A paper describes a structure:
CK2 is involved in the regulation of many cellular processes including cell growth, proliferation and death. The protein is often overexpressed in cancer cells and some become addicted to CK2 activity. As a result, CK2 has emerged as an interesting target in oncology but very few molecules (for example, CX-4945) have made it to clinical trials so far. Our Kinobeads profiling data contained 64 CK2 binders some of which showed very high affinity and selectivity.
Cellular assays validated GSK986310C as a candidate SYK (spleen tyrosine kinase) probe and X-ray crystallography uncovered the structural basis for the observed selectivity of the CK2 inhibitor GW869516X. Another potent and selective inhibitor for CK2 was GW869516X (CATDSCK2 of 1; Kdapp of 78 nM; IC50 of 85 nM) representing an imidazotriazine chemotype unrelated to the RO-compound series. The structure clearly shows GW869516X binding in the ATP pocket of CK2α. The central fused ring interacts with the back of the ATP site and the hinge region, stacking between Met163 and Val66. The indole group sits underneath Val53, projecting away from the pocket. The trimethoxybenzene group protrudes from the ATP site interacting with the end of the hinge region and the top of the αD loop. Examination of the structure of ATP site of a number of representative kinases indicated that a number of residues that cluster around Lys68 are highly conserved across a large number of kinases, whereas residues in the hinge region and around the top of the αD loop are less conserved. GW869516X does not interact with the highly conserved Lys68 or its surrounding residues. CK2 target engagement by GW869516X in cells, was confirmed by NanoBRET assays resulting in IC50 values of 446 and 319 nM for [name] and CK2A2, respectively. GW869516X was less potent in NanoBRET versus Kinobead assays likely because cells contain far higher ATP concentrations than lysates and the plasma membrane of the cell also constitutes a physical barrier.
Numbering used by the authors: 3 to 329
Write the structure that this text describes.
């Protein structure tokens, strides 16, 4: 069967913590007053919640209320524990309150509001310096949560709020986040298609923090090459084929061989034989100002099939690509 795997960093952080830290099922939720918040407008809705802009009438501050649909109402304790564990952390969204929605009768998480610029619009105007600055800000969040024994598992542009005016960034939507425990087999049905790591696409369940570093690599590829998303698969099978057309099939077979993974037999007719592409193939007159040797070296160290070979968030922050960013 598959060869086991463990994170190369923050491996045992949860076992050295009291069970109260990671045993989210035993958590007793402290409830606030729903009357403190007046709903203003619906911002969106996913398959697990409805999101509203609201006003906290006790301080007139703008907030965001995530009302859980009963499908996620079930595993709310996990999200709440993770948000309370990470509160105050660099660039982590602040959970301000937990109230019971009087209409859905489900939990409603109250968060700080970010004056976000739609990523589709914002990514088009980002400069080489802005990409490096924002990537460093995301890394602070990722290294903090990883150091706290938590995997985000849904890193993507939609979950990175950017107030471009104040150059402020928050990592949001911790609904898929999980505590990392060495040797645990996790659900591969996490992240969004374009940012799923090869470990999810090949059904390797013993993954870790490094999954978020593949997702970050995809975001960086989209920003520097001005192609969003960079890997545009039609489904989870074609997603891996899109990856293999860039990284090659030989490194993919070496990765499955190393972990003793049996590739789904449907891949035999669609995968083909591809060699790795040099990153300059993706450079053209329209994105050349965002591409540098440091950017390509950094991307190359994030977009690796072998999750154990990817840069850690702390290692990524030490990379030369961030030397020009003011610290
Ligand atoms: C002022 O305009 C905005 C403000 C915000 N603010 C924001 N601040 C915090 C926060 C949190 C914790 N969750 C969401 C959020 C917004 C949203 C929209 C659709 C689906 C899920 C969503 N989640 N947000 N959104 C978001 C916006 O678009 C995503 C946005 O429109 C561009």
């Amino acid at each position: 069967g598959p060869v086991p795997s463990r994170a190369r960093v923050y491996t045992d952080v949860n076992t050295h913590r009291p069970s109260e830290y990671w045993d989210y099922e035993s958590h007793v939720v402290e409830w606030g007053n729903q009357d403190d918040y007046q709903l203003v407008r619906k911002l969106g809705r996913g398959k697990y919640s409805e999101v509203f802009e609201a006003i906290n009438i006790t301080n007139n501050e703008k907030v965001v209320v995530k009302i859980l649909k009963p499908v996620a109402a079930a595993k709310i304790k996990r999200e709440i524990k993770i948000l309370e564990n990470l509160r105050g952390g660099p660039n982590i969204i602040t959970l301000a309150d937990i109230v019971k929605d009087p209409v859905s009768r489900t939990p409603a998480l109250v968060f700080e509001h970010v004056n976000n610029t739609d990523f589709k619009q914002l990514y088009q105007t980002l400069t080489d310096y802005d990409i490096r600055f924002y990537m460093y800000e995301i890394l602070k969040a990722l290294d903090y949560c990883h150091s706290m024994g938590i995997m985000h598992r849904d890193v993507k542009p939609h979950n990175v709020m950017i107030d471009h005016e104040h150059r402020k960034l928050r990592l949001i939507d911790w609904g898929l986040a999980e505590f990392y425990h060495p040797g645990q087999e996790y659900n591969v049905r996490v992240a969004s298609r374009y940012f799923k790591g090869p470990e999810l696409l090949v059904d390797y369940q013993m993954y870790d923090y490094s999954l978020d570093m593949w997702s970050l690599g995809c975001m960086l590829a989209s920003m520097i090459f001005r192609k969003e998303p960079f890997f545009h698969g039609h489904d989870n099978y074609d997603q891996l084929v899109r990856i293999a057309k860039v990284l090659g099939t030989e490194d993919l077979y070496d990765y499955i061989d190393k972990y003793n993974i049996e590739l789904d037999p449907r891949f035999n007719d669609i995968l083909g034989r591809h060699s790795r592409k040099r990153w300059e193939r993706f450079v053209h007159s329209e994105n050349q100002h965002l591409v540098s040797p440091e950017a390509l070296d950094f991307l190359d160290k994030l977009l690796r099939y072998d999750h154990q070979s990817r840069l850690t968030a702390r290692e990524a922050m030490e990379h030369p690509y961030f030397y020009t960013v003011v610290k």
